[PDB]
Tab-separated table of C-alpha atoms in Angstrom:
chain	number	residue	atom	x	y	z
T	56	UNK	CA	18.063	8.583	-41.915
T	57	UNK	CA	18.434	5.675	-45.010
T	58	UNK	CA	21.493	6.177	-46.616
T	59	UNK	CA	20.234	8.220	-49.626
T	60	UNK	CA	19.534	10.724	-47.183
T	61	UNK	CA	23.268	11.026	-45.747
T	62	UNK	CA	24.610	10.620	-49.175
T	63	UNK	CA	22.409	13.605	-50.048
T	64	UNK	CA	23.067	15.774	-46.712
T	65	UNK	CA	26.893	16.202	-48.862
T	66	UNK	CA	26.281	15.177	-52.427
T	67	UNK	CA	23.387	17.807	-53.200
T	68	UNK	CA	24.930	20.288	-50.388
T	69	UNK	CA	28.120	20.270	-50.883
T	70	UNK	CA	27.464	22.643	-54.356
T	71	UNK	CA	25.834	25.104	-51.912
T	72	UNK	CA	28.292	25.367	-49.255
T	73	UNK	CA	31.258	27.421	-49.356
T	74	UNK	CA	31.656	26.795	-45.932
T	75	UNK	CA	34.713	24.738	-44.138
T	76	UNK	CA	32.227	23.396	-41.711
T	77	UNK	CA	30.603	20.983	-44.713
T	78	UNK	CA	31.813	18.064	-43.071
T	79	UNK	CA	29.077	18.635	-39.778
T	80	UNK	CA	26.358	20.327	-42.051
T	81	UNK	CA	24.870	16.870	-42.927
T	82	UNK	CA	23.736	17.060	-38.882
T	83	UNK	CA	22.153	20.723	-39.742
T	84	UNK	CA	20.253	19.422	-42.632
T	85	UNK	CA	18.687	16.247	-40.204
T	86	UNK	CA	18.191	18.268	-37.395
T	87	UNK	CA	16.191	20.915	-39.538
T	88	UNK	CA	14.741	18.137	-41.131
T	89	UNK	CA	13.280	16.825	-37.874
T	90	UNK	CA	12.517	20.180	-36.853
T	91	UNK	CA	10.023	20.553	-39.787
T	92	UNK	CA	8.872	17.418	-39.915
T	93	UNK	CA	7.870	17.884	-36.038
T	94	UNK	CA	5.453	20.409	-37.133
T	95	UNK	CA	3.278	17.301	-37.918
T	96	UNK	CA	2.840	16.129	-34.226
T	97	UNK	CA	3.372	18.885	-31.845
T	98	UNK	CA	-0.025	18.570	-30.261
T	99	UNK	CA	-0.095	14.893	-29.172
T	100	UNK	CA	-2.121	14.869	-25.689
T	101	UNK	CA	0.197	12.598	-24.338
T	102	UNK	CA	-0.302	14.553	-20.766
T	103	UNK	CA	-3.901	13.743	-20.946
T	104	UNK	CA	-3.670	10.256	-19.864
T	105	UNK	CA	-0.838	11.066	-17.662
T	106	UNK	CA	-3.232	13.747	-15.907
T	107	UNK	CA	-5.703	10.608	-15.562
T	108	UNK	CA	-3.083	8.265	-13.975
T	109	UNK	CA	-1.749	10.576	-11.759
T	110	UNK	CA	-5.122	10.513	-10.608
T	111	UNK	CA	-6.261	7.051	-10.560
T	112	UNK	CA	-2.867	6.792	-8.664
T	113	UNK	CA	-3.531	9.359	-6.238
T	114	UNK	CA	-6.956	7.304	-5.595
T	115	UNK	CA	-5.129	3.387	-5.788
T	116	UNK	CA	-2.524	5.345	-3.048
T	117	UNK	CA	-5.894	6.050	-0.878
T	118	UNK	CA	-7.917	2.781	-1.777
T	119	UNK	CA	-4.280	1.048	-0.469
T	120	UNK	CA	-4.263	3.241	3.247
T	121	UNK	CA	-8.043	1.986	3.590
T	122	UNK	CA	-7.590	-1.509	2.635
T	123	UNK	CA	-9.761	-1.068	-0.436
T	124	UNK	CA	-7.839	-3.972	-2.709
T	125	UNK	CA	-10.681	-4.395	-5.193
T	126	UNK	CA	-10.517	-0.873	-5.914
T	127	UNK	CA	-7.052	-0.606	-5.766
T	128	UNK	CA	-6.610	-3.451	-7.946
T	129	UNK	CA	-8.873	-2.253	-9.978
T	130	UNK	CA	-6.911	1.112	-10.136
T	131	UNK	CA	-3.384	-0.802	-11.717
T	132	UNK	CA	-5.411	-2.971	-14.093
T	133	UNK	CA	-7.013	0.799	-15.851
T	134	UNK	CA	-3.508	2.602	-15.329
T	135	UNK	CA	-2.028	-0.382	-16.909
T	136	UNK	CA	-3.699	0.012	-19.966
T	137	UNK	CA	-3.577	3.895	-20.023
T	138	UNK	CA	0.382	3.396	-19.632
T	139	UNK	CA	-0.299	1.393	-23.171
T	140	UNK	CA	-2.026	3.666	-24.490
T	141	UNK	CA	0.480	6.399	-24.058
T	142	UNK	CA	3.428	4.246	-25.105
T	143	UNK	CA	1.620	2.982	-28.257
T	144	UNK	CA	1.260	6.846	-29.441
T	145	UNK	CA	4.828	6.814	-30.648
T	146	UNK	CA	3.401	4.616	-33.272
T	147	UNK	CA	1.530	7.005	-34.641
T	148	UNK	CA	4.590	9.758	-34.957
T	149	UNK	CA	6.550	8.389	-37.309
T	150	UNK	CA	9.599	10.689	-39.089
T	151	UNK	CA	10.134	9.866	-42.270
T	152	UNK	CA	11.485	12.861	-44.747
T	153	UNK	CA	11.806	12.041	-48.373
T	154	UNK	CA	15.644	12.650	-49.476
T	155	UNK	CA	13.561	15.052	-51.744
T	156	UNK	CA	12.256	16.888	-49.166
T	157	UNK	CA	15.440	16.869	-47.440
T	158	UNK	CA	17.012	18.165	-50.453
T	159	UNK	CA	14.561	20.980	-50.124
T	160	UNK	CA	16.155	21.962	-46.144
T	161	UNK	CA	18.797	23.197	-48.370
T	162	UNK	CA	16.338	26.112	-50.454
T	163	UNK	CA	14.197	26.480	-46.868
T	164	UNK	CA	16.639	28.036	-44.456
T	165	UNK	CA	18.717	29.609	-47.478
T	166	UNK	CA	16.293	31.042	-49.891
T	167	UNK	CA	18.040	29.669	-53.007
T	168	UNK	CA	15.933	28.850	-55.481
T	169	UNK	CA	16.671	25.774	-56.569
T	170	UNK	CA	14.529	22.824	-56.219
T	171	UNK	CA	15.087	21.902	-59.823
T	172	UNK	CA	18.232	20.346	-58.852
T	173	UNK	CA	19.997	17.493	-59.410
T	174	UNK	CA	23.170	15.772	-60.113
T	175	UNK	CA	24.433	19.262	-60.855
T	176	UNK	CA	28.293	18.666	-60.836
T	177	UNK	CA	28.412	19.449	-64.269
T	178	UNK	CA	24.991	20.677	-64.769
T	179	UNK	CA	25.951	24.001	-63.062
T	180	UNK	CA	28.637	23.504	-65.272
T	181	UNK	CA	27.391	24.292	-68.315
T	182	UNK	CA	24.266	25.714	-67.764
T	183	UNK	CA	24.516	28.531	-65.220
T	184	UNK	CA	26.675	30.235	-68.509
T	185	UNK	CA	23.750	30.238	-70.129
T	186	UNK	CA	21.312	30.415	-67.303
T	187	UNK	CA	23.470	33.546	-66.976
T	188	UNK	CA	22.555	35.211	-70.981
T	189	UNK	CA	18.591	35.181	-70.406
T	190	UNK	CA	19.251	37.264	-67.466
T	191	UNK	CA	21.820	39.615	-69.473
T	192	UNK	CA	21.346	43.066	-70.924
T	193	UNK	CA	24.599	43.254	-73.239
T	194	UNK	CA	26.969	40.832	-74.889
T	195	UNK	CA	27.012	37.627	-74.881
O	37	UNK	CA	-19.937	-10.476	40.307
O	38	UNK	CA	-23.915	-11.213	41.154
O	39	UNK	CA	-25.472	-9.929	44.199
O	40	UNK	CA	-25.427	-12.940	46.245
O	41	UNK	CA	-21.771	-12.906	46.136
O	42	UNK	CA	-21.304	-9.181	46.831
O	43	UNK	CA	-23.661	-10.143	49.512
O	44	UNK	CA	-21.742	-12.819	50.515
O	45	UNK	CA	-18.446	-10.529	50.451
O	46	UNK	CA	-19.718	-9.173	53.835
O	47	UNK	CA	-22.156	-11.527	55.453
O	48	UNK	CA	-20.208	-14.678	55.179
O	49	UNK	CA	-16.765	-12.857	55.691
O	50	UNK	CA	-17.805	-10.129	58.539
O	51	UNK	CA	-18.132	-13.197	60.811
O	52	UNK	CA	-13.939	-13.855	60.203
O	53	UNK	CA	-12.583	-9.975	59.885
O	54	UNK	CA	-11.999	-8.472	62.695
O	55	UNK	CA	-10.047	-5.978	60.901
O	56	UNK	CA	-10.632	-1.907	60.390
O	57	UNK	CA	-10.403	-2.755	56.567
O	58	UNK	CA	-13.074	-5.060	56.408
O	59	UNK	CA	-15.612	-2.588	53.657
O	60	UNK	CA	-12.626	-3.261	51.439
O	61	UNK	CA	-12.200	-6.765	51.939
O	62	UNK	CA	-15.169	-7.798	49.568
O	63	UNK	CA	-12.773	-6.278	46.676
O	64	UNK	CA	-10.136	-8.694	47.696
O	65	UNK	CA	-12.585	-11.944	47.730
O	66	UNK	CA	-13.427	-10.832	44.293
O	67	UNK	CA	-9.858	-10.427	43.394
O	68	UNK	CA	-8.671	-13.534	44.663
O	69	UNK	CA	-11.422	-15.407	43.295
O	70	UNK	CA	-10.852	-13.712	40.105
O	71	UNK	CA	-7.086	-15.009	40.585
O	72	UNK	CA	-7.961	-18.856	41.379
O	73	UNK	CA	-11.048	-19.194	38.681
O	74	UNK	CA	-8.616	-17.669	36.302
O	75	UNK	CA	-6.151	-21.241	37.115
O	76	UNK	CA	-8.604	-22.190	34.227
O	77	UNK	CA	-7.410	-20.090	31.630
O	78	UNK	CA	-3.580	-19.218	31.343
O	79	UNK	CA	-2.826	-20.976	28.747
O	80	UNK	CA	-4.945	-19.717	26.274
O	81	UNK	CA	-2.561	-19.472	22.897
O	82	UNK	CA	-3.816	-15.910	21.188
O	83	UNK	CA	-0.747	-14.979	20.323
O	84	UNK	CA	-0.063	-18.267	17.630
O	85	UNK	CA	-2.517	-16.320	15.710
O	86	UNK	CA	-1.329	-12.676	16.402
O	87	UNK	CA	1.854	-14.185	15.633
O	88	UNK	CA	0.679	-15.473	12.316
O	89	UNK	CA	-0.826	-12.239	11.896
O	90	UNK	CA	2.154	-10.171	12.236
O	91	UNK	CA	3.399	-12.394	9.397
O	92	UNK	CA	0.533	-12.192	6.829
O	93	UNK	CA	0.381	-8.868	7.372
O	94	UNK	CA	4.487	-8.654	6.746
O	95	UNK	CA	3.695	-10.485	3.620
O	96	UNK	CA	0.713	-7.914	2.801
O	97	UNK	CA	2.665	-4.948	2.848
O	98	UNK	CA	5.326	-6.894	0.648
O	99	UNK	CA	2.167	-7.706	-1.924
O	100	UNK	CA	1.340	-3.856	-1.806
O	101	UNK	CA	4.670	-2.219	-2.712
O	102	UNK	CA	5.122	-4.950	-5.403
O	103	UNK	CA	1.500	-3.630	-6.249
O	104	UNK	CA	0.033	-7.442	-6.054
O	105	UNK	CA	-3.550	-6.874	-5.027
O	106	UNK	CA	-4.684	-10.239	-5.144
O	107	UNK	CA	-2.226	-11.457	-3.103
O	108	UNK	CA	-3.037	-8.390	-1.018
O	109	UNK	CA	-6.667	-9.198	-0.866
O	110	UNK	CA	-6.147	-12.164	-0.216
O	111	UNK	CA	-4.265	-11.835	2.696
O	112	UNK	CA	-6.856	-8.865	4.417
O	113	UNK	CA	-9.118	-11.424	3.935
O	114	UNK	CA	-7.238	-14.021	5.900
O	115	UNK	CA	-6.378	-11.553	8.848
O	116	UNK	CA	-10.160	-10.562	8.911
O	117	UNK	CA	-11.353	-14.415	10.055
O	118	UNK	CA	-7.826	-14.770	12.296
O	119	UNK	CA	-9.023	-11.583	13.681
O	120	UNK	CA	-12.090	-13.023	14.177
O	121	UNK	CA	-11.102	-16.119	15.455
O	122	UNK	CA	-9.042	-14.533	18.189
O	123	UNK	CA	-12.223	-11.947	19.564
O	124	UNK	CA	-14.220	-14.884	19.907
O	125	UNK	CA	-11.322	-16.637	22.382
O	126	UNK	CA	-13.094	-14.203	25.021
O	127	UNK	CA	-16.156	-16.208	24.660
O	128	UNK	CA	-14.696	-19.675	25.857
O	129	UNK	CA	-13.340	-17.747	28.778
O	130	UNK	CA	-16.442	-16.777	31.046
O	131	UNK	CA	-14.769	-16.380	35.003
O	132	UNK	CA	-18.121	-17.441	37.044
O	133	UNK	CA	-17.665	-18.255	40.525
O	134	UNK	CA	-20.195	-20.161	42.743
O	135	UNK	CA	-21.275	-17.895	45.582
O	136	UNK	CA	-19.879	-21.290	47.939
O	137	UNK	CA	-16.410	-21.344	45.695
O	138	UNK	CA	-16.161	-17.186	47.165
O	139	UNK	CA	-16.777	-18.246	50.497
O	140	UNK	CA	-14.383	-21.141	49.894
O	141	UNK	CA	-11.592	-18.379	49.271
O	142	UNK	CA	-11.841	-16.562	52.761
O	143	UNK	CA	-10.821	-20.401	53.611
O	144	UNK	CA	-8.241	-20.686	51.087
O	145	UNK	CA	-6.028	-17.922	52.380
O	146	UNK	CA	-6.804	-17.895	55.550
O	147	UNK	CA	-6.067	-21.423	57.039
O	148	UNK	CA	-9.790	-21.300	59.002
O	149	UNK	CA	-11.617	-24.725	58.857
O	150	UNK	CA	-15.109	-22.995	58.156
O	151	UNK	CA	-16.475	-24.921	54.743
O	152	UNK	CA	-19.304	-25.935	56.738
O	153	UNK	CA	-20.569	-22.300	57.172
O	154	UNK	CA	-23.500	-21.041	56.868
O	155	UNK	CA	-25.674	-18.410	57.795
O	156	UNK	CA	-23.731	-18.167	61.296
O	157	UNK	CA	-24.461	-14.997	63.244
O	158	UNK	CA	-26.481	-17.051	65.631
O	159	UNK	CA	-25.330	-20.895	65.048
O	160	UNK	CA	-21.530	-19.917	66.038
O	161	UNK	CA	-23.326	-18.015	69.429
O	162	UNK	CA	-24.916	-21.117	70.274
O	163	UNK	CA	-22.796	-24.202	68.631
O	164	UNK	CA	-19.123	-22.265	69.730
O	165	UNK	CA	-19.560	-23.051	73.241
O	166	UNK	CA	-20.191	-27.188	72.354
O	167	UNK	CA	-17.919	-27.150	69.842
O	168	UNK	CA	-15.597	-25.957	72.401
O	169	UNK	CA	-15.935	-28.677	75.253
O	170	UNK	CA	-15.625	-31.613	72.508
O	171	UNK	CA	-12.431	-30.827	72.407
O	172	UNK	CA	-11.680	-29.858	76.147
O	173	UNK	CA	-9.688	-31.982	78.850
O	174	UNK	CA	-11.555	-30.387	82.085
O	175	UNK	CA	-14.506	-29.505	83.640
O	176	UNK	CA	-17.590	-28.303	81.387
């Protein structure tokens, strides 16, 4: 969370918020942020590997009652590198929003359509009066 | 325990029981003589292995919760040719009597002067009575 992204969790939502709770809706915006950006990896088979230790444990616990030491041995050196394998898939799961897209939390759970935006403190300013007129049936 | 001595439990000893319990008494010439042959062997140190053992294997159970199989191996395979070594103590022990060392023990606790014996059913009949008079102050 860089600090364009913090600066923009109150600087681009802080025209959309009527709310008194603005000061904690920069933690909204990165937890919804996460939350959608999680749709990327929910379906690492982390477990997978566990399933296998958990086995090849189950076996170096038997190999160790019987005395078996190559096998067992053998048993921690694979688990060893499964364990590696597991902890080396972070890696690959990397969150990492644009403060664009995080600007776009704001339209997502809202429905406002305004992607467009901006360093609309005086933008809105001046143009939603005449955003206003091309929607108008009367006078002006 | 060979036949000539479980011969010689009764035939040499029958002549010197005059006892109820002599069809027992060959158990206790083989017992005693078991008893005195084994003068040869109490001393026998087994247990500095077993003792060393008992340590390893203290040490080996150490290697296995710290999940160190080569120590652990290594130390199985240590025990294995201590083990060894102590089994094969038995074979430096072999209890063998002479057939004249079991008729020595119905001497030994007995008190009876009788080393020079034989195959005396007849020769104490016959020798007895001039054995006697050799040592007799008196008429013949």
């Amino acid at each position: 969370l860089p600090d364009e992204v913090l600066k923009a969790a109150v600087d681009y939502s802080v025209q959309y918020i009527p709310q008194r709770s603005l000061p904690d809706k920069a933690i909204d915006l990165v937890d919804v942020t996460a939350a959608h950006l999680a749709a990327q990896h929910p379906v690492t088979d982390v477990h997978a590997v566990e399933r296998e230790i958990e086995t090849e444990k189950d076996k170096q616990e038997k190999a160790v009652e019987a005395e078996d030491f190559e096998a067992a041995l053998n048993y921690k050196t694979r688990i060893a590198e499964l364990e590696r394998k597991i902890e080396n898939h972070t890696e690959d799961m990397k969150v990492t929003a644009s403060v664009n897209d995080v600007a776009e939390s704001v339209e997502r759970m809202t429905g406002i359509p305004v992607s467009q935006m901006g360093a609309s403190d005086i933008e809105r300013l001046k143009d939603m009066a005449h955003r206003l007129q091309d929607k108008v049936i009367g006078q002006d």
